A paper describes a structure:
[name] ([name]), a major virulence factor of the bacterium, is a pore-forming toxin belonging to the family of cholesterol-dependent cytolysins (CDCs). [name] is produced as a water-soluble monomer and recognises mammalian cells via its C-terminal domain (domain 4) before assembling into circular prepores of ~30–50 monomers on the surface of cholesterol-rich membranes. The monomers in the prepore undergo critical structural changes, including the unfurling of two alpha helical bundles (α-HB1 and α-HB2) in domain 3 in each monomer that are then refolded into β-hairpins (transmembrane hairpins TMH1 and TMH2) for insertion into the membrane, which is facilitated by a structural collapse towards the membrane surface. The resultant [name] β-barrel pore has a diameter of ~300 Å that causes lysis of the target cell.
[name] adopts the canonical CDC fold with maximal dimensions of 123 Å by 20 Å by 49 Å. The most significant difference between [name] and the other CDCs is that it adopts a linear shape down its long axis whereas the other CDCs tend to be bent to various degrees due to different orientations of D4 with respect to the rest of the molecule. A significant difference, not observed in any of the published CDC structures, is the high mobility of regions of two strands (residues 29 to 35, 46 to 50) in D2. Consequently, the hydrogen bond interactions that D2 forms with both D3 and D4 that are typically observed in SLY and other CDCs are absent in [name]. Two gold cyanide compounds, used to improve the quality of the crystals, are bound to Cys 428. In one site the gold complex packs against Trp 435 and Trp 436 and the other packs against Tyr 461 from a symmetry related molecule. The Trp-rich loop in [name] D4 (residues 427 to 437) adopts the same conformation as that previously seen in SLY and SLO, despite the binding of the gold complex to Cys 428. The monomers in the crystal are tightly packed in an elongated linear arrangement. The buried surface between [name] subunits is extensive, with more than 1500 Å2 buried in the interface (750 Å2 from one monomer and 770 Å2 from the second). Thus it seems the linear oligomers observed in the ILY, LLO and [name] structures are glimpses of the very early stages of weaker monomer-monomer interactions required before the interactions become strong enough to drive the conformational changes needed to induce circularisation of the oligomer.
Numbering used by the authors: -2 to 470
Amino acid sequence: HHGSANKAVNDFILAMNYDKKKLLTHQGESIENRFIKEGNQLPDEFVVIERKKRSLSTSTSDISVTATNDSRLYPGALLVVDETLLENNPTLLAVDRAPMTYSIDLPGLASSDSFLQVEDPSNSSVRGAVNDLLAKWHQDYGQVNNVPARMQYEKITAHSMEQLKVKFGSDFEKTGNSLDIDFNSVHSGEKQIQIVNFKQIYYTVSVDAVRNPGDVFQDTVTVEDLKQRGISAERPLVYISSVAYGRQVYLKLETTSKSDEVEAAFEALIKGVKVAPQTEWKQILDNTEVKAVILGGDPSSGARVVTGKVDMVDDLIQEGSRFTADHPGLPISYTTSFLRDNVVATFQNSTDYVETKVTAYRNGDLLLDHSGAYVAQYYITWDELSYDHQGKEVLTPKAWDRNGQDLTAHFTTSIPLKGNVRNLSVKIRECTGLAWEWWRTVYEKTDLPLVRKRTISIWGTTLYPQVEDKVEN
């Protein structure tokens, strides 16, 4: 502005030519898994894994923040555009700055003096400017009613730690690593997981468009000083054009189960006051469930890692639902704009993942009771399933120990089966003592269904056998 240095600085930037899209793309990896696999052992139920690769490509302009005391995330701030910016750890360009005018969008001022001037932008001045206003709004408002926080929720079922980054931000670890997350237990086919990111905005602070690239500096600054800090074209500049300020929860859910109507549990659980009347399946699921949850927000400092089950008990959802300027909020996300032209910077982050689907097949028992006045015989055959390599399959047949044996009395045994069991046949003859018909076949199903507890129960007399076929799922 007027002085020959600034002007030269202004030319510099304006003249910059570069690829806004080839600079804001970060990458992880791909390597192809052929599909294949399948096949798995068990404990108290038998699964088939099978891992079918998939592809995550996000692009936003809003950047999640999992900091609090991050001194370089203030609106106005210039960031360099280089590898560290993609990773959410940007090289800050402190350099003598000119003043700025920020807007602020909460209710109680609409236009009148919902504006602010700062002489030297910095985390401090800009905070202390804000925190001044948040008083005279508490002094007019906040205590007017519940000024309510604008919520915004997102989900992803897990699959890998990196693929999570591409959903929640190039900086997830210091949150990930904290929620205790076991994928060794989901490429096994054991656990299955989903992760929520609840956001609660109280207010937002933003910057009108910079009319000239020079305008952001002071006349003390030269191009030489910018070159000396590595700005190029190759490494241009953005400015933090907006910041939203509030509370955040990241939150991870894991269950024993594998019901292919599990997702449904959550979505309706999340909706809060949506108890279901016990008994249910979209309620058994939740009762075998264990959380871990991080709060960045409301009482400023660091994070609150916390766990509980749900039993709805963890409803911190509406914890910070009301604003009112008691304690301000911390910064949750921000936006950047190139200085050259005020174009919002838009980051395209991609990776493809190790995607592992799972499938049911519980395992019950078959129980026999013989309380008949006669002799009987069981022929009980089946096929035990597995997958070796390529998967394909492996049906090695099998057969009860007492096939053939004559059983009397009151005989009971419980033959237990597992999920891979298939082609289960069961035959039962009783013996009549009639010369022309030695045996009645009294029961004979092929491909019995596999159930928690089938119990076949034969009784009665030689000429008048009774049979109960009882399933119990």
